[PDB]
GROMACS .gro file of N, CA, C and O in nm:
model
  244
    1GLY      N    1  -0.833   1.341   1.531
    1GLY     CA    2  -0.897   1.244   1.624
    1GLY      C    3  -0.815   1.117   1.641
    1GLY      O    4  -0.722   1.114   1.722
    2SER      N    5  -0.849   1.014   1.565
    2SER     CA    6  -0.778   0.887   1.573
    2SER      C    7  -0.689   0.867   1.451
    2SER      O    8  -0.737   0.863   1.338
    3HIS      N    9  -0.559   0.851   1.474
    3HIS     CA   10  -0.466   0.828   1.364
    3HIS      C   11  -0.472   0.682   1.326
    3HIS      O   12  -0.458   0.594   1.410
    4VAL      N   13  -0.496   0.656   1.198
    4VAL     CA   14  -0.507   0.519   1.151
    4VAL      C   15  -0.415   0.494   1.033
    4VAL      O   16  -0.362   0.588   0.974
    5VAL      N   17  -0.397   0.368   1.000
    5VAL     CA   18  -0.310   0.330   0.889
    5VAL      C   19  -0.378   0.230   0.796
    5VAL      O   20  -0.470   0.159   0.836
    6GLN      N   21  -0.332   0.228   0.671
    6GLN     CA   22  -0.389   0.139   0.569
    6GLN      C   23  -0.279   0.069   0.490
    6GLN      O   24  -0.168   0.121   0.480
    7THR      N   25  -0.309  -0.048   0.434
    7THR     CA   26  -0.208  -0.120   0.357
    7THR      C   27  -0.241  -0.125   0.209
    7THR      O   28  -0.355  -0.102   0.168
    8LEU      N   29  -0.139  -0.154   0.129
    8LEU     CA   30  -0.153  -0.162  -0.015
    8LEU      C   31  -0.090  -0.291  -0.069
    8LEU      O   32  -0.138  -0.349  -0.166
    9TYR      N   33   0.019  -0.334  -0.006
    9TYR     CA   34   0.090  -0.454  -0.048
    9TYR      C   35   0.103  -0.554   0.066
    9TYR      O   36   0.159  -0.522   0.171
   10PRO      N   37   0.053  -0.678   0.048
   10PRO     CA   38   0.062  -0.781   0.151
   10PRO      C   39   0.205  -0.831   0.168
   10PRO      O   40   0.235  -0.948   0.146
   11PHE      N   41   0.293  -0.739   0.205
   11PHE     CA   42   0.435  -0.770   0.223
   11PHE      C   43   0.464  -0.819   0.364
   11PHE      O   44   0.392  -0.790   0.459
   12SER      N   45   0.571  -0.897   0.375
   12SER     CA   46   0.613  -0.956   0.501
   12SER      C   47   0.720  -0.874   0.573
   12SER      O   48   0.799  -0.804   0.510
   13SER      N   49   0.723  -0.886   0.706
   13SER     CA   50   0.821  -0.816   0.789
   13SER      C   51   0.946  -0.902   0.805
   13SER      O   52   0.948  -1.018   0.763
   14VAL      N   53   1.052  -0.846   0.865
   14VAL     CA   54   1.176  -0.920   0.883
   14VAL      C   55   1.232  -0.909   1.025
   14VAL      O   56   1.258  -1.011   1.090
   15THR      N   57   1.255  -0.787   1.072
   15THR     CA   58   1.311  -0.765   1.206
   15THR      C   59   1.242  -0.852   1.311
   15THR      O   60   1.130  -0.899   1.291
   16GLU      N   61   1.312  -0.874   1.423
   16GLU     CA   62   1.260  -0.957   1.532
   16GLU      C   63   1.145  -0.888   1.604
   16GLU      O   64   1.054  -0.955   1.655
   17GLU      N   65   1.147  -0.756   1.609
   17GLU     CA   66   1.041  -0.680   1.676
   17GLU      C   67   0.926  -0.652   1.580
   17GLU      O   68   0.853  -0.554   1.597
   18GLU      N   69   0.910  -0.737   1.480
   18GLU     CA   70   0.804  -0.720   1.382
   18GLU      C   71   0.697  -0.826   1.396
   18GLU      O   72   0.703  -0.911   1.485
   19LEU      N   73   0.600  -0.821   1.306
   19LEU     CA   74   0.490  -0.916   1.306
   19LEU      C   75   0.458  -0.959   1.163
   19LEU      O   76   0.455  -0.876   1.072
   20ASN      N   77   0.434  -1.088   1.143
   20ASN     CA   78   0.402  -1.138   1.010
   20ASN      C   79   0.258  -1.190   1.003
   20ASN      O   80   0.230  -1.302   1.042
   21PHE      N   81   0.171  -1.106   0.949
   21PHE     CA   82   0.030  -1.138   0.930
   21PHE      C   83  -0.011  -1.098   0.788
   21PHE      O   84   0.060  -1.021   0.724
   22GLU      N   85  -0.122  -1.149   0.738
   22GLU     CA   86  -0.164  -1.113   0.604
   22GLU      C   87  -0.234  -0.978   0.605
   22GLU      O   88  -0.354  -0.968   0.631
   23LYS      N   89  -0.158  -0.873   0.576
   23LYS     CA   90  -0.210  -0.738   0.571
   23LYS      C   91  -0.289  -0.713   0.443
   23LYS      O   92  -0.253  -0.763   0.337
   24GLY      N   93  -0.396  -0.636   0.454
   24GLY     CA   94  -0.477  -0.606   0.337
   24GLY      C   95  -0.569  -0.488   0.360
   24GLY      O   96  -0.588  -0.405   0.271
   25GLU      N   97  -0.625  -0.480   0.480
   25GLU     CA   98  -0.716  -0.373   0.516
   25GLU      C   99  -0.642  -0.261   0.588
   25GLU      O  100  -0.525  -0.233   0.559
   26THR      N  101  -0.710  -0.195   0.681
   26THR     CA  102  -0.650  -0.085   0.755
   26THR      C  103  -0.620  -0.122   0.900
   26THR      O  104  -0.694  -0.197   0.964
   27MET      N  105  -0.512  -0.065   0.951
   27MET     CA  106  -0.468  -0.086   1.088
   27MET      C  107  -0.431   0.049   1.148
   27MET      O  108  -0.417   0.146   1.075
   28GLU      N  109  -0.418   0.057   1.279
   28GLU     CA  110  -0.385   0.183   1.345
   28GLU      C  111  -0.248   0.176   1.409
   28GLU      O  112  -0.221   0.091   1.493
   29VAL      N  113  -0.161   0.268   1.369
   29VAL     CA  114  -0.026   0.275   1.422
   29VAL      C  115  -0.017   0.368   1.542
   29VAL      O  116  -0.060   0.483   1.537
   30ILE      N  117   0.038   0.315   1.651
   30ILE     CA  118   0.054   0.391   1.775
   30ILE      C  119   0.189   0.462   1.779
   30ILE      O  120   0.199   0.575   1.826
   31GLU      N  121   0.292   0.393   1.732
   31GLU     CA  122   0.427   0.448   1.731
   31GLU      C  123   0.453   0.528   1.604
   31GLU      O  124   0.449   0.474   1.493
   32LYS      N  125   0.480   0.657   1.620
   32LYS     CA  126   0.507   0.744   1.506
   32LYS      C  127   0.657   0.767   1.490
   32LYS      O  128   0.733   0.754   1.586
   33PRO      N  129   0.702   0.800   1.368
   33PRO     CA  130   0.844   0.823   1.339
   33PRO      C  131   0.891   0.964   1.373
   33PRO      O  132   1.003   1.002   1.340
   34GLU      N  133   0.806   1.042   1.440
   34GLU     CA  134   0.842   1.178   1.479
   34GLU      C  135   0.912   1.180   1.614
   34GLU      O  136   0.997   1.265   1.640
   35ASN      N  137   0.876   1.086   1.700
   35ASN     CA  138   0.936   1.076   1.833
   35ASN      C  139   1.002   0.940   1.853
   35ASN      O  140   1.107   0.929   1.917
   36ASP      N  141   0.941   0.837   1.796
   36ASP     CA  142   0.993   0.701   1.807
   36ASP      C  143   1.074   0.665   1.683
   36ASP      O  144   1.067   0.735   1.581
   37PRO      N  145   1.153   0.557   1.689
   37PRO     CA  146   1.237   0.512   1.577
   37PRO      C  147   1.163   0.514   1.444
   37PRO      O  148   1.044   0.546   1.437
   38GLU      N  149   1.234   0.480   1.337
   38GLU     CA  150   1.177   0.479   1.202
   38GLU      C  151   1.073   0.368   1.185
   38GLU      O  152   1.010   0.358   1.080
   39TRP      N  153   1.056   0.284   1.287
   39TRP     CA  154   0.960   0.174   1.279
   39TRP      C  155   0.836   0.204   1.363
   39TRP      O  156   0.846   0.267   1.469
   40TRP      N  157   0.720   0.158   1.317
   40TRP     CA  158   0.596   0.179   1.390
   40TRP      C  159   0.528   0.045   1.418
   40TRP      O  160   0.570  -0.058   1.366
   41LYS      N  161   0.424   0.046   1.501
   41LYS     CA  162   0.353  -0.077   1.536
   41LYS      C  163   0.204  -0.054   1.555
   41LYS      O  164   0.162   0.045   1.615
   42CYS      N  165   0.124  -0.146   1.503
   42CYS     CA  166  -0.021  -0.137   1.514
   42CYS      C  167  -0.079  -0.273   1.553
   42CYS      O  168  -0.015  -0.376   1.532
   43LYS      N  169  -0.198  -0.272   1.610
   43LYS     CA  170  -0.263  -0.396   1.653
   43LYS      C  171  -0.353  -0.454   1.545
   43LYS      O  172  -0.431  -0.383   1.481
   44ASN      N  173  -0.341  -0.585   1.527
   44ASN     CA  174  -0.419  -0.659   1.430
   44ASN      C  175  -0.520  -0.744   1.502
   44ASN      O  176  -0.518  -0.754   1.625
   45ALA      N  177  -0.606  -0.809   1.426
   45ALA     CA  178  -0.705  -0.897   1.486
   45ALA      C  179  -0.636  -1.026   1.532
   45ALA      O  180  -0.701  -1.121   1.576
   46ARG      N  181  -0.504  -1.027   1.519
   46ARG     CA  182  -0.421  -1.139   1.556
   46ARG      C  183  -0.389  -1.138   1.706
   46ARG      O  184  -0.331  -1.233   1.758
   47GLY      N  185  -0.425  -1.029   1.774
   47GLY     CA  186  -0.397  -1.018   1.916
   47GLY      C  187  -0.256  -0.968   1.944
   47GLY      O  188  -0.225  -0.926   2.055
   48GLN      N  189  -0.170  -0.972   1.841
   48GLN     CA  190  -0.032  -0.927   1.853
   48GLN      C  191  -0.005  -0.811   1.760
   48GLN      O  192  -0.045  -0.812   1.644
   49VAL      N  193   0.068  -0.712   1.809
   49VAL     CA  194   0.106  -0.599   1.726
   49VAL      C  195   0.257  -0.591   1.720
   49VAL      O  196   0.324  -0.585   1.823
   50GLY      N  197   0.309  -0.589   1.599
   50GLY     CA  198   0.452  -0.580   1.582
   50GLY      C  199   0.490  -0.454   1.510
   50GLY      O  200   0.413  -0.358   1.504
   51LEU      N  201   0.608  -0.454   1.453
   51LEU     CA  202   0.656  -0.339   1.379
   51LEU      C  203   0.629  -0.359   1.230
   51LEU      O  204   0.689  -0.444   1.166
   52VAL      N  205   0.536  -0.280   1.177
   52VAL     CA  206   0.500  -0.290   1.036
   52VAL      C  207   0.582  -0.194   0.952
   52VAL      O  208   0.596  -0.076   0.985
   53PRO      N  209   0.637  -0.243   0.840
   53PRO     CA  210   0.717  -0.161   0.747
   53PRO      C  211   0.630  -0.067   0.665
   53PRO      O  212   0.559  -0.110   0.574
   54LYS      N  213   0.636   0.061   0.698
   54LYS     CA  214   0.558   0.163   0.628
   54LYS      C  215   0.578   0.155   0.477
   54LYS      O  216   0.494   0.202   0.400
   55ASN      N  217   0.690   0.098   0.437
   55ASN     CA  218   0.723   0.085   0.295
   55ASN      C  219   0.628  -0.011   0.226
   55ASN      O  220   0.626  -0.022   0.103
   56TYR      N  221   0.550  -0.082   0.306
   56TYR     CA  222   0.455  -0.178   0.254
   56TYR      C  223   0.313  -0.137   0.288
   56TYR      O  224   0.220  -0.216   0.276
   57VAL      N  225   0.297  -0.012   0.333
   57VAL     CA  226   0.166   0.038   0.370
   57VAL      C  227   0.152   0.189   0.347
   57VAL      O  228   0.247   0.257   0.311
   58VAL      N  229   0.031   0.238   0.373
   58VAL     CA  230  -0.001   0.380   0.362
   58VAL      C  231  -0.089   0.421   0.479
   58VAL      O  232  -0.197   0.365   0.498
   59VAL      N  233  -0.042   0.516   0.558
   59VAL     CA  234  -0.117   0.561   0.675
   59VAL      C  235  -0.248   0.628   0.635
   59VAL      O  236  -0.257   0.693   0.531
   60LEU      N  237  -0.350   0.609   0.718
   60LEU     CA  238  -0.482   0.665   0.693
   60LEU      C  239  -0.544   0.719   0.822
   60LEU      O  240  -0.597   0.644   0.902
   61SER      N  241  -0.536   0.850   0.839
   61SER     CA  242  -0.591   0.915   0.957
   61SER      C  243  -0.705   1.010   0.919
   61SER      O  244  -0.761   1.074   1.011
   0.00000   0.00000   0.00000
């Protein structure tokens, strides 16, 4: 149904196409690493969605 993502470590991003928000709960990633680059992006309650480092999270679908 809906592919979703979850976080474990409130780690910060670096790349310019990323987003720096206090991660803690679950988010939904639209960009997958199967067709798109190794980076993914999900929307936060911040109104902005950047590229979140999977190395600092765990997907939850």
